CSV table of C-alpha atoms in Angstrom, one decimal:
chain,number,residue,atom,x,y,z
A,1,UNK,CA,132.7,153.7,70.5
A,2,UNK,CA,131.1,151.8,73.3
A,3,UNK,CA,131.4,148.6,75.4
A,4,UNK,CA,128.0,146.9,76.0
A,5,UNK,CA,127.2,145.5,79.4
A,6,UNK,CA,127.0,142.1,77.7
A,7,UNK,CA,130.7,142.5,77.0
A,8,UNK,CA,130.3,143.1,73.3
A,9,UNK,CA,132.2,146.1,71.8
A,10,UNK,CA,130.8,148.6,69.4
A,11,UNK,CA,133.3,149.6,66.7
A,12,UNK,CA,133.1,152.6,64.3
A,13,UNK,CA,132.6,150.2,61.4
A,14,UNK,CA,129.5,148.8,63.2
A,15,UNK,CA,127.7,152.2,62.9
A,16,UNK,CA,129.3,153.7,59.8
A,17,UNK,CA,131.0,153.1,56.4
A,18,UNK,CA,134.7,154.0,56.4
A,19,UNK,CA,136.3,154.9,53.1
A,20,UNK,CA,138.6,157.3,51.3
A,21,UNK,CA,136.3,159.8,49.5
A,22,UNK,CA,136.8,163.5,49.1
A,23,UNK,CA,136.7,166.6,51.2
A,24,UNK,CA,134.0,168.0,48.9
A,25,UNK,CA,131.6,166.5,46.4
A,26,UNK,CA,130.3,169.6,44.6
A,27,UNK,CA,132.6,169.7,41.6
A,28,UNK,CA,132.5,166.9,39.0
A,29,UNK,CA,134.8,167.1,36.0
A,30,UNK,CA,134.2,165.2,32.7
A,31,UNK,CA,136.5,165.2,29.7
A,32,UNK,CA,134.6,164.1,26.6
A,33,UNK,CA,132.2,162.3,29.0
A,34,UNK,CA,135.0,160.4,30.8
A,35,UNK,CA,135.6,161.0,34.5
A,36,UNK,CA,138.4,163.5,35.0
A,37,UNK,CA,140.3,165.8,37.3
A,38,UNK,CA,142.7,168.6,36.5
A,39,UNK,CA,144.5,171.8,37.5
A,40,UNK,CA,143.0,175.2,36.6
A,41,UNK,CA,146.3,177.1,36.7
A,42,UNK,CA,146.2,180.9,36.8
A,43,UNK,CA,149.0,183.2,35.7
A,44,UNK,CA,150.6,185.4,38.4
A,45,UNK,CA,150.4,189.1,38.1
A,46,UNK,CA,153.0,190.6,35.7
A,47,UNK,CA,154.3,187.2,34.6
A,48,UNK,CA,155.3,185.7,31.3
A,49,UNK,CA,152.7,183.3,29.9
A,50,UNK,CA,154.9,181.3,27.5
B,1,UNK,CA,128.4,183.6,84.8
B,2,UNK,CA,124.9,182.2,84.2
B,3,UNK,CA,123.9,185.4,82.3
B,4,UNK,CA,127.0,185.1,80.0
B,5,UNK,CA,126.4,181.4,79.4
B,6,UNK,CA,122.8,182.0,78.5
B,7,UNK,CA,123.6,184.9,76.2
B,8,UNK,CA,126.3,182.8,74.5
B,9,UNK,CA,124.0,179.8,74.0
B,10,UNK,CA,120.9,181.7,72.9
B,11,UNK,CA,122.6,184.3,70.7
B,12,UNK,CA,124.7,182.3,68.2
B,13,UNK,CA,125.1,181.2,64.6
B,14,UNK,CA,124.9,177.4,64.1
B,15,UNK,CA,125.8,175.6,60.9
B,16,UNK,CA,123.1,173.0,59.9
B,17,UNK,CA,123.9,171.5,56.5
B,18,UNK,CA,121.9,171.0,53.3
B,19,UNK,CA,118.8,169.3,51.9
B,20,UNK,CA,119.9,167.0,49.1
B,21,UNK,CA,123.5,167.8,49.5
B,22,UNK,CA,126.5,166.1,47.9
B,23,UNK,CA,127.2,163.2,47.6
B,24,UNK,CA,123.4,162.8,46.9
B,25,UNK,CA,121.1,160.0,46.3
B,26,UNK,CA,120.6,158.9,42.7
B,27,UNK,CA,117.1,160.3,42.2
B,28,UNK,CA,117.5,163.6,44.2
B,29,UNK,CA,115.8,166.5,42.5
B,30,UNK,CA,115.6,169.2,45.3
B,31,UNK,CA,118.5,171.0,46.9
B,32,UNK,CA,118.1,173.6,49.6
B,33,UNK,CA,120.3,175.1,52.3
B,34,UNK,CA,119.3,174.4,55.9
B,35,UNK,CA,119.1,177.6,58.1
B,36,UNK,CA,119.3,177.2,61.8
B,37,UNK,CA,119.9,179.4,64.9
B,38,UNK,CA,121.1,182.8,63.9
B,39,UNK,CA,122.1,185.9,66.0
B,40,UNK,CA,119.4,187.9,67.7
B,41,UNK,CA,118.2,191.2,66.3
B,42,UNK,CA,116.4,193.3,69.0
B,43,UNK,CA,116.4,194.1,72.7
B,44,UNK,CA,113.1,192.3,72.8
B,45,UNK,CA,114.7,189.0,71.8
B,46,UNK,CA,117.5,189.5,74.3
B,47,UNK,CA,115.0,190.2,77.1
B,48,UNK,CA,113.3,186.9,76.3
B,49,UNK,CA,116.5,184.9,76.8
B,50,UNK,CA,115.7,182.2,79.3
C-alpha cells in the first residue's frame, strides 16, 4: 500500500484482516440449532415435481 | 465542462452503508440504513449548485 520514507513497507495485512468470509452476512441458517446451509430449490413453470 | 462536472458531482445518488450492519458486533441492538447524498428535487436546488 505504501513505502515509508524510512524505507519500511506498508502491506495490506498491516492495516487489515484478510480472510475468506462471505459476500453477504444477512442470512443465517440453523438446522435444529446447528449451523447449516442449503438450497431452496424452486420448481420450473409447467414441470413435473416428482 | 465546469457546469457539467458540477451538476454531476452535486446531483447524484451515493451509497453509504448501514448502522449496525452485518457481520455485527456481539452486543449490537440497533440497525438503521445510512442515507447520503440523493438527487436534487427543484430548480432552486439546482440554482444553488456551486
